[PDB]
Design a protein around this nucleic acid. Structure first.
Ligand SMILES: [Zn+2]
Ligand SMILES: [Zn+2]
Ligand SMILES: [Zn+2]
Ligand SMILES: [Zn+2]
Lengths: 100, 257, 815, 70, 198, 89, 32, 31
RNA sequence: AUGAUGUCAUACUUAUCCUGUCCCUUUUUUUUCCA
């Protein structure tokens, strides 16, 4: 399940060549990788619409508020605040460790 | 080998060990290696005479190569931990239960006690977790430990705790310094070393036992306790060292890496 | 005293810690002062060192060297120290290890050559009459070593006085043990003293004690074995009572007397041997019923010695010894033992060689029908050894029918993998030859019945029996039965079990090898298309047998198959090249050579070049081996333009394949490469200038094989031109390329000559750099090891200097 | 490498002396002149000496090659 | 402990054979005596370089290969490149289709042409001297083109028949100071082909 | 096809005859080739004597065929170098 | 083989050069 | 500590004697 | 301007090789407590 940077560059080139909805055509290039793994790797880490910035005050307030409202439903919470589920879960854990 | 009882015969004033009366004489090479070991241990003088440290060696009745734990205690503190280590090394029957069938539960119960730095710390962990548990038979049954051989280890530890004023060693502990525990073990174990898939002294090839905690993850320097040959030249009760404090103890025996 | 002892431990630490030149200098200084130091402190420092268990093999060898040098420098100086050296060396003389007993014998020889025999004799005289048998045996071994070192007449009157002494029978027993062990240590050296030792031991041979007479018979047997074949009459004084004593002794003494009789029998006169055989044959007929294992082993050894004894007739043995021997020694209890079965088999083979194998074969034919597997295996092994030793000329017709029925029942009950029984079956029917023709349809019907069995092992064994018996089926030229067997095996070719399919393929390969292509039913044009999908199998045995059959067909009968099918075979062989066993790949390369010899070397070369440029895996060196085999079998002028043009491909791996194929090609062709050295010279010159070390290493292998190939043909100019590129590459640090450089330098020194290598190394042997002069000294040391004789004439002309004269005046002499 | 390869006649090392190499070359030249019949005949019949006298002179000159070491 | 380069130059008959670091050797006189013989070779230059031998190029391009004349006269390169270009346009469906259904008779020229090119048309190539040592260059300074002689391209470009226009000024100006040992034939040393001097 | 370890004997050869197993049959004992088996293999000493009777002069299997030197090793006459039986040290 | 002339670095694979995009600092050093 | 303090007992045993019961190895009917 | 340095991956070489390992018995001291 590891991802080398060579495979990330090949995946980026394959997405820029073959579009989005083709994944088995993309996974034909990558040795020992599946199309589901390529789709998850694109939508989790390598998508350019992922906000790779720092959290604002408004983002942290909305994250703490929505984590108080809907507990442990991060796939619902994450499109509201614009981050992904892993980043917002990790930042919520970091904020609870900072509050403790 | 007669390494336990050469010290017993020397503690009773007999000096003519090679000319002592017997039904049949023991071989002179066994007595030579026993006297060479007791020269390497801190009990014999330049004239082959017992010291007062040799009287401390011969007070408590376990093997001298094990009894250098006690004289290594208070030099690296941590006396109670190596006391319980010597209690599990003083047993007769084998520890841990490996039944016909089951296997996987018993192997997982063995792996759950594993610690880095040999199986002496594993046996110390077994006595530590048996403590604060009511000394129950149900804990030993649930962890695949024989409740016949480790009660004997408890009695040996109790007897050796009672025989601590005669050696005048206090109840010392470190609570975390297992490097000090392994250093005290290495102070007790300098003769029993081998590295290079080969003995460092006798130049005999070695093979790791599968029941040891370090069967995989082959070490850089290691000591042991026993050298039983059954099929391959095996490796019983290994322990991790670095050969850095190996030169700190027994400098006459150890030179040139 | 104290300073001498301090110097003794100084020499000890210099020997055991210093260099072996410094150890040799310390040993020379110790031996120079051995009379000065004395044997006292030398013994007091050596015998604790000899008794030390921590000494290594080199340490004890150096200890034996120091003891031998000190003994040679001391001689009689260790005369008070004989007893201490003896009690140290007496466990060393009873050593179980061979090297330790050899070192103890060397120490005993040094003690006998240094001190004297009289001091050791007076030392061992109270130890001769020791009550314990172990101390008496140690004393016997030490005195035998002393008698072997000092010679037989030095203590032979002393040993006669000990054995003639009636003080104690244990000392006489020890003396006879001394005589027996000295005879065992000597062997042929006791030949002039055989009559003297026989006269010494003739008093002990008639002793009333059981153990003394037993060891006297053992010493007489040892003297008969050691002095073979001289001194037959010298033991003749023991020939009269011992033959009476075999009629008198019982138990272990009877066995010792029988062993002495069996050792004394093959040297006597023929009438005397016949009379002794007729005398001891009644005792042997009594002793066949003896249940003791060592007594039965001694009886079997005596029977083998009597059968090996000439002049014991033929009909007398077959009428006297053989029926109770077959009644007693041939049972399941005899076959249940391990060493006794082998001894009985060797004795049976020796007796069948002595008195004809037909009687033993007729008397042991029913035991192949026995229910016991190990007994039937032993009988089949003895029958196979007797048939391989003598033959099948004396076999009767009903005897031959009984043998065929016995081996058919033996093959019919084969629970284990008795492959030696299969080899025995092949040996018996190949020894029969043309006489098995009436029995052939019964054998064929039984094998074809067992081929329909449920078990795969039965079908595998039946096909193995076909593969064993195909040659003898084709000796009689009964081609209808063999063709019918080939048709049935062609039907059986669609089996799914791999071991069975490999056995069927091996049987078909045997049938094709013993019939030939023209009378082969089914024909090759129907056989090879059936064999084509079997090459896609992944099992190793199927691949090995099928590739062997395809190679036999392509070497022998390739005219029946069109070239399209051969190209399909080649395309399958490319996938077959990725196997694991090296024999499969070697036979694959041989099939590639056979197909290229059959149909032409062009399209198969293009196929191999595409495979070489296409593989990029842990294979394709075998592709280069196949390319070299194709070129060597098909006139390498036809192959070298395409191989040279394949070097222009920039695909980073095909060029190394081209160079490796060139190296393998030159190693295959040898002395025929001189037409192509000038062709491959600029390719190797361009390859040696490459950045990559792989090209330089493989080109170095090319230079090595090309230099070793056409040595002695005047192509040294191109070899020197290639050496002008190879010799800059000697500074490489990788081990493979520097091994290729060393091999290329060795090949260039063989081919061009040591003069140019000496010219290359003379300006760099005295280089200021340590590593450069070290590498140049390694190359010069290899050249001097290879060319020690020829380097004198190729030595440089250097004039005489102030250190010594250098210009030899013998070379300036003109006659 | 090998121990006998370094222990062979004419062998050397990176710290081999020039006088030792010259003495080994002279000893090898004397041994080659003694072994070869044609070289001994060319170096013997040129002067007025016997063949065995030339062999004894070469045997003396073999020890003379170790005559002045440094 | 060791003398300077002047003592080694005075002691040896060849001061040009003395190296810069030969004085620190244990036997500098023996090394100078061995280096002054006619059939010696120098140390390769990689012993002083930190760079490995023929390793630090890393950025240049080279021609692939130059075949000899008889191999190109057989003409294997033409249909070999045609077969490679035909196989490059093929698909793997067509590749296994050709694998199960082969097509031979591709080149199929003869055996006699290669037999003649191996034997009748066999030409001895150019081999260098015994003392030659290849190095990182040794492929560019091919003039060893004599000095004092103009090249054929410069003679054709300046209209020099085989009388250059600057040869009169070269004769009137004497020998050049850059190469005083160079002798120009025809005007200073009274020259075959383009090499009209030495 | 070699390894940097496994020096063989470097002993003086004798009258004992080398012997090869089928797993490494046909190989040269020195350079591991398969071309021109010319010179027979002599195995010096107690490599033959004792329990190692008729064994492999290579890996250690039960030997079936006579070992040989190739012609290329005997071009420089490496066959007189000594015993080629592998001793694992 | 793939070579970066701005970095003067050889690459075994295509993704080795595809990950060679340090190269900015080497390009700034080789710019002058 | 030193070497010959382990060798004086072996020297005294060498000067005293040796018994066959000490280090007894069983071997008979050898070839 | 190319030297050292790191288990990071990718190429490459040796006609490298498809592979093995869990103890019979058993023995060794001494000293206090509540109406
Ligand atoms: Zn083998
Ligand atoms: Zn070879
Ligand atoms: Zn050998
Ligand atoms: Zn770059």
């Amino acid at each position: 399940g590891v991802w080398r940077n060579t495979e990330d560059e090949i995946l980026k080139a394959a997405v820029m060549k073959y579009g989005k909805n083709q994944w088995s055509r993309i996974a034909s290039l990558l040795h020992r990788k599946s199309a589901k793994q390529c789709k998850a790797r694109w939508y989790e880490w390598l998508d350019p619409s992922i906000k790779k910035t720092e959290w604002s005050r408004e983002e942290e307030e909305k994250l703490l508020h929505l984590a108080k409202l809907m507990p442990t439903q991060w796939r619902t919470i994450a499109p509201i605040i614009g981050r992904t589920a892993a980043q917002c879960l990790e930042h919520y854990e970091f904020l609870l460790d900072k509050a403790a | 080998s007669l390494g336990n009882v050469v010290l017993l015969l020397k503690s009773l004033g007999i000096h003519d060990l090679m000319h002592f009366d017997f039904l049949d004489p023991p071989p002179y090479e066994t007595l030579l290696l026993a006297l060479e070991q007791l020269y390497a241990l801190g009990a014999l003088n330049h004239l082959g005479e017992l010291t007062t440290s040799g009287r401390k060696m011969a007070e408590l009745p376990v093997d001298p190569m094990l009894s250098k734990m006690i004289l290594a205690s208070e030099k690296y503190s941590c006396s109670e931990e190596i006391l319980t280590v010597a209690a599990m090394l003083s047993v007769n029957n084998s520890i841990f239960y490996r039944p016909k069938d089951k296997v996987v539960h018993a192997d997982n119960a063995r792996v759950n006690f594993f610690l880095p730095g040999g199986d002496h710390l594993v046996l110390l962990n077994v006595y530590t977790q048996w403590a604060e548990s009511g000394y129950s038979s149900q804990w030993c049954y649930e962890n695949f430990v024989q409740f016949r051989s480790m009660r004997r280890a408890r009695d040996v530890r109790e007897q050796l705790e009672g025989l601590l004023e005669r050696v005048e060693v206090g109840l010392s502990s470190c609570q975390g310094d297992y490097i000090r525990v392994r250093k005290a073990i290495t102070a007790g174990y300098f003769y029993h070393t081998a590295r290079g898939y080969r003995t460092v002294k006798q130049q005999q090839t070695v093979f790791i036992h599968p029941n040891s905690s370090l069967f995989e993850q082959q070490p850089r320097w290691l000591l042991y306790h026993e050298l039983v040959l059954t099929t391959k030249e095996f490796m019983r009760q290994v322990l991790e060292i670095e050969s850095s404090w190996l030169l700190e103890v027994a400098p006459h025996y150890y030179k040139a890496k | 005293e104290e300073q001498k002892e301090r110097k003794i431990m100084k020499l000890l630490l210099k020997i055991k810690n210093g260099t072996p030149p410094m150890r040799k200098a310390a040993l020379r200084q110790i031996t120079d002062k051995a009379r000065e130091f004395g044997a006292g402190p030398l013994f007091n420092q050596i015998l604790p060192l000899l008794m030390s268990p921590t000494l290594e093999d080199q340490e004890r060898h150096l200890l034996v060297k120091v003891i031998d040098r000190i003994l040679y420098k001391l001689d009689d100086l260790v005369r008070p120290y004989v007893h201490k050296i003896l009690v140290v060396i007496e466990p060393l003389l009873i050593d179980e290890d061979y090297y330790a007993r050899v070192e103890g014998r060397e120490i005993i020889s040094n003690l006998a050559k240094a001190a004297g025999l009289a001091t050791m004799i007076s030392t061992m005289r109270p130890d001769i009459d020791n009550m314990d048998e172990y101390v008496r045996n140690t004393t016997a071994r030490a005195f035998a070593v002393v008698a072997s070192a000092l010679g037989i007449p030095s203590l032979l009157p002393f040993l006669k006085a000990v054995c003639k002494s009636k003080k104690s029978w244990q000392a006489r027993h020890t003396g006879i043990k001394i005589v027996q062990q000295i005879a065992i240590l000597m062997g042929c050296a006791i030949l002039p003293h055989l009559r003297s030792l026989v006269e010494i031991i003739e008093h002990g041979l008639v002793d009333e004690q059981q153990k003394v007479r037993t060891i006297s018979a053992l010493a007489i047997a040892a003297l008969a074995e050691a002095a073979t074949p001289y001194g037959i009459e010298s033991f003749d004084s023991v020939l009269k009572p011992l033959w009476k004593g075999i009629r008198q002794h019982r138990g272990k003494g009877l066995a010792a007397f029988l062993k002495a009789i069996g050792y004394l029998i093959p040297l006597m006169d023929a009438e005397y041997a016949n009379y002794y055989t007729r005398e001891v044959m009644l005792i042997l007929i009594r002793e066949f019923q003896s249940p003791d294992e060592e007594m039965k082993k001694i009886v079997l050894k005596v029977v083998k010695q009597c059968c090996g004894t000439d002049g014991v007739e033929a009909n007398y043995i077959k009428t006297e010894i053989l029926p109770p021997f077959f009644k007693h020694f041939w049972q399941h209890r005899m076959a249940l033992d391990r060493r006794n079965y082998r001894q009985l088999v060797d004795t049976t083979v020796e007796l069948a060689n002595k008195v004809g194998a037909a009687e033993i074969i007729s008397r042991i034919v029913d035991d192949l029908k026995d229910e016991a597997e190990q007994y039937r295996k032993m009988v089949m092994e003895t029958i196979e050894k007797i048939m391989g030793n003598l033959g099948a000329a004396d076999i009767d017709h009903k005897l031959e029918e009984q043998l065929i029925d016995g081996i058919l029942y033996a093959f019919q009950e084969q629970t284990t993998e008795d492959s030696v029984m299969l080899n025995g079956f092949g040996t018996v029917v190949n020894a029969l030859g043309k006489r098995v023709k009436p029995y052939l349809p019964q054998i064929c019907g039984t094998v074809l019945w067992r081929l329909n069995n449920k078990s795969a092992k039965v079908r595998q064994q039946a096909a193995d029996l076909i593969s064993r018996t195909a040659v003898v089926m084709k000796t009689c030229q009964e081609e209808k039965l063999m063709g019918h067997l080939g048709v049935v095996l062609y039907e059986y070719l669609g089996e799914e079990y791999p071991e069975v399919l490999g056995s069927i393929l091996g049987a078909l390969k045997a049938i094709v090898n013993v019939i030939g292509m023209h009378k082969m039913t089914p024909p090759i044009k129907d056989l090879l298309p059936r064999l084509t999908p079997i090459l896609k199998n992944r099992h190793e045995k199927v691949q090995e047998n099928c590739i062997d059959l395809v190679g036999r067909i392509a070497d022998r009968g390739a005219e029946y198959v069109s070239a399209r099918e051969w190209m399909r075979i080649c395309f399958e062989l490319l996938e077959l090249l990725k196997a694991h066993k090296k024999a499969i790949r070697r036979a694959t390369v041989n099939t590639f050579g056979y197909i290229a010899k059959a149909i032409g070397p062009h399209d198969v070369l293009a196929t191999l070049l595409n495979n070489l440029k296409v593989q990029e895996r842990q294979n394709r060196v075998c592709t280069t081996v196949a390319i070299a085999i194709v070129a060597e079998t098909c006139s390498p002028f036809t192959v070298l333009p395409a191989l040279m043009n394949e070097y222009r491909v920039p695909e980073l791996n095909v060029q190394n394949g081209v160079l490796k194929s060139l190296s393998f090609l030159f190693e295959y062709i040898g002395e025929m490469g001189k037409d192509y050295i000038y062709a491959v010279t600029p390719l190797l010159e361009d390859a040696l200038m490459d950045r990559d070390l792989v090209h330089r290493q493989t080109a170095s292998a090319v230079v090595q094989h090309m230099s070793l190939g056409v040595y002695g043909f005047g192509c040294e100019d191109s070899l020197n031109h290639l050496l002008n590129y190879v010799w800059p590459n000697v500074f490489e640090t990788s081990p493979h390329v520097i091994q290729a450089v060393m091999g290329a330098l060795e090949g260039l020194r063989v081919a061009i000559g040591p003069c140019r290598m000496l010219q290359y190394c003379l300006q760099g042997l005295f280089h200021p750099a340590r590593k450069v002069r070290d590498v140049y000294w390694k190359i010069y040391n290899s050249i001097y090891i290879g060319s020690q004789d020829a380097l004198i004439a190729h030595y440089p002309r250097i004039y005489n200097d102030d250190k010594n004269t250098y210009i030899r005046y013998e070379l300036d002499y003109i006659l | 490498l090998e121990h006998l390869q370094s222990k062979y006649i004419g062998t050397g090392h990176a710290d081999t002396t020039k006088w030792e190499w010259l003495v080994n070359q002279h000893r090898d030249s004397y041994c080659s002149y003694m072994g070869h019949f044609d070289l001994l005949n060319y170096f013997a019949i040129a002067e007025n000496e016997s063949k065995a006298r030339v062999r004894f002179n070469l045997m003396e000159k073999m020890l003379q090659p170790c005559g002045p070491p440094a | 402990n060791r003398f300077t380069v002047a003592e080694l130059k005075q002691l040896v008959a060849r001061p040009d054979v003395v190296e810069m670091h030969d004085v620190t050797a244990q036997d500098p006189k023996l090394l100078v005596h061995l280096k002054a013989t006619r059939n010696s070779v120098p140390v390769p230059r990689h012993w002083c370089f930190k760079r490995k031998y023929l390793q630090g190029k890393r950025g240049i391009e080279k021609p692939p290969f130059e075949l000899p004349d008889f191999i190109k006269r057989t003409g294997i390169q033409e249909m070999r490149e045609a077969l490679q270009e035909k196989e490059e346009q093929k698909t793997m469906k067509s590749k296994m289709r050709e694998k199960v259904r082969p097509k031979m008779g591709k080149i199929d020229i003869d055996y006699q042409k290669l037999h003649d090119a191996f034997f009748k048309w066999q030409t001895k190539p150019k081999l260098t001297i015994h003392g030659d040592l290849y190095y990182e260059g040794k492929e560019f300074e091919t003039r060893l083109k004599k000095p004092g002689d103009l090249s054929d391209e410069l003679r054709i470009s300046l209209g020099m028949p085989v009388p250059p226009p600057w040869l009169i000024a070269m004769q009137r100006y004497g020998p050049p100071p850059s190469y005083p040992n160079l002798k120009i034939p025809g005007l200073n040393s009274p020259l075959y082909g383009d090499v009209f001097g030495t | 096809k070699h390894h940097p370890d496994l020096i063989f004997c470097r002993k003086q050869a004798g009258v004992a005859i080398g012997r090869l197993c089928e797993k490494c049959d046909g190989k040269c004992v020195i350079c591991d080739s398969y071309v021109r088996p010319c010179t027979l293999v002599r195995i010096c000493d107690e490599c033959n004597y004792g329990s190692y009777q008729g064994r492999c002069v290579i890996c250690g299997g039960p030997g079936v065929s006579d070992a040989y030197y190739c012609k290329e090793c005997t071009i420089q006459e490496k066959d007189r170098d000594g015993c080629p039986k592998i001793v694992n040290l | 083989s793939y070579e970066c002339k701005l970095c003067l670095t050889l690459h075994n694979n295509e993704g080795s050069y595809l990950a060679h995009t340090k190269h900015q600092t080497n390009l700034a050093r080789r710019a002058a | 500590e030193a070497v010959p303090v382990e060798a004086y007992g072996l020297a005294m045993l060498r000067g005293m004697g040796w018994k066959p019961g000490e280090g007894i190895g069983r071997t008979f009917n050898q070839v």
